[PDB]
Every structure is written in structure tokens, then in C-alpha cells.
Design an enzyme around this catalytic site. Structure first.
Site, PDB file in Angstrom:
ATOM      1  N   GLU A   1      -2.725 -31.452 -61.735  1.00 27.07           N
ATOM      2  CA  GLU A   1      -3.468 -30.184 -61.905  1.00 27.07           C
ATOM      3  C   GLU A   1      -4.317 -30.211 -63.157  1.00 27.07           C
ATOM      4  OE1 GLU A   1      -1.001 -27.233 -58.951  1.00 27.07           O
ATOM      5  OE2 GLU A   1      -1.233 -26.593 -61.082  1.00 27.07           O
TER       6      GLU A   1
ATOM      7  N   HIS B   1      -7.315 -32.010 -61.958  1.00 24.08           N
ATOM      8  CA  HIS B   1      -8.203 -31.010 -61.331  1.00 24.08           C
ATOM      9  C   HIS B   1      -9.034 -30.313 -62.409  1.00 24.08           C
ATOM     10  CE1 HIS B   1      -4.939 -30.781 -57.847  1.00 24.08           C
ATOM     11  NE2 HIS B   1      -5.666 -31.881 -57.757  1.00 24.08           N
TER      12      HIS B   1
ATOM     13  N   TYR C   1     -13.245 -30.280 -63.393  1.00 26.90           N
ATOM     14  CA  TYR C   1     -14.030 -29.060 -63.402  1.00 26.90           C
ATOM     15  C   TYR C   1     -14.802 -28.977 -64.663  1.00 26.90           C
ATOM     16  CZ  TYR C   1     -12.430 -26.927 -59.100  1.00 26.90           C
ATOM     17  OH  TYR C   1     -12.267 -26.619 -57.721  1.00 26.90           O
TER      18      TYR C   1
ATOM     19  N   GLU D   1      -1.010 -20.817 -54.831  1.00 27.46           N
ATOM     20  CA  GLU D   1      -1.404 -22.113 -54.470  1.00 27.46           C
ATOM     21  C   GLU D   1      -1.704 -22.205 -53.013  1.00 27.46           C
ATOM     22  OE1 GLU D   1       2.114 -24.031 -56.452  1.00 27.46           O
ATOM     23  OE2 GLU D   1       0.469 -25.521 -56.755  1.00 27.46           O
TER      24      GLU D   1
ATOM     25  N   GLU E   1      -4.207 -28.973 -53.337  1.00 29.85           N
ATOM     26  CA  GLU E   1      -3.576 -27.646 -53.319  1.00 29.85           C
ATOM     27  C   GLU E   1      -2.900 -27.401 -52.006  1.00 29.85           C
ATOM     28  OE1 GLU E   1      -3.767 -26.557 -56.617  1.00 29.85           O
ATOM     29  OE2 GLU E   1      -3.095 -25.044 -55.243  1.00 29.85           O
TER      30      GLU E   1
ATOM     31  N   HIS F   1       0.673 -28.529 -52.139  1.00 32.26           N
ATOM     32  CA  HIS F   1       1.531 -27.810 -53.087  1.00 32.26           C
ATOM     33  C   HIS F   1       1.965 -26.565 -52.393  1.00 32.26           C
ATOM     34  CE1 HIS F   1      -1.137 -29.829 -56.424  1.00 32.26           C
ATOM     35  NE2 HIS F   1      -0.351 -30.696 -55.802  1.00 32.26           N
TER      36      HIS F   1
HETATM   37 FE    FE Z   1      -1.843 -26.679 -57.157  1.00 32.33          FE
END
Ligand code: FE
Ligand code: FE
EC number: 1.17.4.1
Lengths: 258, 258
Positions: B79, B82, B86, B141, B175, B178
């Protein structure tokens, strides 16, 4: 940002590995050709590695720099992968479950854990100084298991044990990275510690480490000399004091060039 | 042991990926070929993604099953990846520091945050029931950002934005994993919730999510329809309720087959 910290992340990241690349396939023949004092050294060491804990996650919430939280959150994943590797090894050399456990209690009461926990009580998971914690941390990830790690390399120099030694390889290389890392955070540190304190933390980590490899579970019976090993710790310790920007305390040359 | 939870770990792990595999090199030409309404939709959605927190770490301490902490400790690293991706995208589409900042200062008061925050206060980061937390988590999530994720597929259907859409794809997939996960833990749950309450949590997630893409930053002009979106949420949320082992609440078919 903090560009030197980000380099450690990208190096850990690009250095990522999993337990699937290991394939214990090929040497329990080695372990059964091994002899009787060497067999329970291994069975104990692997069972010692699988005992030690929350650490990075305690610095994950303290260190307020994105570059660094990123390195620590990546630490816990990789460290979980070291953990599985051991559970998988413990799964192959100590194949049937009777003995797994007969041997997990067997550690619990192993004065090396008396020493390892009491030390963790005095400096780590503590409530006085952040500075103290990273120093004690850099010992956990620098001085502790240093002995145990070297003793698996003694099997690698015999071309035995199949990724007992190759895993060992990746794990100590990994744990090496973590060590340089806590140095750099020390290096960025607001108010550094007086060298007098850092050497106490260090000496005590050393004395704690030695009660594993030279005393609790003697390397002096996989083929090694407990006194030479005791000298390897000293040298590891000194290396670490230099990485921490401190002068040495045991000035001692490399007992093994391997 | 919990072999089904092990499978999600080994599928996360084996599905690991880094920011290096994206290389945004080839389409800010698209970005500047785009138009005004789409420019700032994107600059705002990217900024929205980079604003929300600690979650898995809170489950890392609670859920006392090795296989599961393993999945959670790896969630937080992926994460982080992730997040970085970004940050890197905000770094290209919004290249000049001028606006990086006037933009997280638009966002940091957007009604969608008041929504997002308040519902996080009522359900998550809370002190009543662990069951509630997982349901609310499965929403975080699962339903949250589902709107925004689909809006970036809109740009993937137009063969534009290079890994705006490709990362978008790896992040949604991720995602996705998860969400499925949080289902399984509810599925192994000691004492499951009455579906009456699960539906409340989800409703409120849905409303919170809509306040983003159909209200605060309307998909309705990257080319999409706000109402059609609003039904994609409902459908998404319905799917979740089945995943959670509950009956639906807005029975609505797939507005977009893509
Ligand atoms: Fe997630
Ligand atoms: Fe480590």
C-alpha cells in the site's frame, strides 16, 4: 526529501526475495551424513532464530519521515519472509512434530533468552530516549545473530546444506542492510548520544550475543572455535561502532577472511 | 493452520510489483491533448488518492493468526508502493510545486473528506466491536475509491494515459485482493453480525463514496454519467454484501460491462 534513505528502500525493494526461491530439495542427505553434535546444533540454531517480536513497527510510528516509514514497513514484510524460511527449514530438518515442540520449550529456558530479553527490557521497548532505542536497535540488527550467522557459513565452506546456507546468505545480507540503515538514521539524528552510552549498549549486546554461540549453543561443535568466534563478535561490534560514528572498544582483526 | 488465508498471502506475494514497472514516459502528451474539465478531474483524483492512514496495522495487532498477520504486514508494504506511485504521478501530471500544494489544500476540506472522516469515526478507529471494524474495513477497501478507480478505466477505454490506467489497473486488482480477504476473516468469524447492521455500514460507505465521484468531483465530465456511476457503486456494494455472506439491498445490474 531524504535521498540517502530512499536509496536503502530501493535497494531493499530491488533485493526482495521469497521462500519459493530456496527449494530445500537436495540436502537432508547432507544432514543425515552430518554427525551427532552437528545435528543438534542446527536443530537448536533454527529453533533459536524462530523465537524473536515487534520492533520496526515501533519505529514506523515514531520516525516521521515518509522515506523512512517506507523502509520500515518494507522491513516487516521481508522479516516475515525470513520467518517463513525458518519455519520451512524447521519443517525439513526437524520433520516430525513430536520433536519440533519437544524443543521449543527447550529454548524458552536457555539463558541466552534470559540475556536477550533482559537486555531488551533495559534499552528497547523502553521509555526514556529515542536515541538509545535506535542504537540498541542497530545492535539487534547488527550484533545479535552475528554469531549464528557465521556458524551456518561454516557449513557453506564445506559445501553442505543446500540453502540452509543460501537462505542464511540472503538473510544475513538482508539483516546487513537493516544495520547500515539504523546508522543512517543515527547519522541524521537531532541530538546524538555521548559515545560513553553507545559503548555500553554495545558491550552489553556483545555479552548477550556471546551467551548464544560461545556458551548456550557452542559453535565449538560444528567444527568452530568458541574463542575465535568470540573474537568475530568483537570485530562485528567494532565495525558497528564505526558505522555509528564512534571509536572502537575491542580493536580486533578479522578472525576469518571468509 | 489456516490454509485459505495462506493462499491470499502467496497470491499477494506472487503478485508483488513496484513503481519501477510503470515508467510514465510516454503520455503527458495525452494529458495536454486532453481538455480542461478532464485535466482537473485527474489532478484532483490523484490528489484525492494521496490523503488517506493506519488500518492494517490495527488488525496486525488484533488478529492473532500467523498466516493473517503475514497478509497484513505485506498489505502495508504494497500500500506504500501504491502511495509512491501516486506521488510519482502527481509528480508528472502536476509537475510544478506551485500547484502540488494549492491542491492538497483544495482537497483537505472537500465535503467528501468530511464524509470520509466522519464515517471513519463512527465505524473504524473505534472502540466497540471487532466485527464492525472488519465490515467497515471491507468497505474501505471495497466500496471506497471504486468510483474513482472506474473513472480511470474510462481513460483506459480511450487508449490514453499510459499507466495512469495501467497502475490504476494494478492498484484496483490489488485492492480487489484485500477486499476478498476481509471477507474471509468475517467468514472465519467467532460471532458474525446481524445483517441489519452490516447493511448500515455499507449504505453509509456507499453514500460516502458517492459524495466523491458523483458530487465532489464528478465523473460527469471526464465523459461519464453521474447516475450510471451511482449505480456502479450500488452494484459494487451489492457484490460486497454477497462476499460478506449477506443479502443485497439495491439489486442493480452491471451498468458497464467493461
Ligand atoms: Fe488496500
Ligand atoms: Fe532485519
Amino acid at each position: 526529501m531524504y535521498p540517502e534513505v530512499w536509496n536503502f528502500y530501493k535497494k531493499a525493494e530491488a533485493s526482495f526475495w521469497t521462500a519459493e526461491e530456496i527449494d530445500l530439495s537436495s540436502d537432508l542427505k547432507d544432514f543425515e551424513k552430518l554427525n551427532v553434535n552437528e545435528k543438534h546444533f542446527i536443530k537448536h540454531v533454527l529453533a533459536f532464530f524462530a523465537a524473536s517480536e515487534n520492533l520496526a513497527s515501533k519505529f514506523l510510528r515514531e520516525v516521521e519521515i515518509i522515506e523512512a516509514k517506507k523502509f520500515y514497513s518494507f522491513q516487516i514484510a521481508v522479516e516475515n519472509i525470513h520467518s517463513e524460511t525458518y519455519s520451512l527449514l524447521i519443517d525439513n530438518y526437524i520433520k516430525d512434530e513430536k520433536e519440533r515442540l519437544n524443543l521449543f520449550h527447550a529454548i524458552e529456558n536457555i539463558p541466552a533468552i534470559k540475556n536477550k530479553a533482559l537486555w531488551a527490557a533495559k534499552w528497547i521497548n523502553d521509555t526514556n530516549s529515542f536515541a538509545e532505542r535506535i542504537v540498541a536497535n542497530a545492535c539487534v540488527e547488527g550484533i545479535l545473530f552475528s554469531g549464528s550467522f557465521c556458524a551456518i557459513f561454516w557449513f557453506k565452506k564445506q559445501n553442505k546444506l543446500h540453502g540452509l546456507t543460501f537462505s542464511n546468505e540472503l538473510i544475513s545480507r538482508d539483516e546487513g542492510l537493516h544495520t547500515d540503515f539504523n546508522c543512517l538514521i543515527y547519522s541524521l539524528l537531532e541530538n546524538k548520544l555521548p559515545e560513553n552510552v553507545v559503548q555500553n549498549i554495545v558491550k552489553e549486546a556483545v555479552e548477550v550475543e556471546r551467551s548464544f554461540i560461545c556458551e548456550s549453543l557452542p559453535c565449538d561443535l560444528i567444527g568452530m572455535n568458541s574463542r575465535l568466534m568470540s573474537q568475530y563478535i568483537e570485530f562485528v561490534a567494532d565495525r558497528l561502532l564505526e558505522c555509528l560514528g564512534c571509536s572502537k572498544v575491542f580493536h580486533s582483526k578479522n578472525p576469518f577472511n571468509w
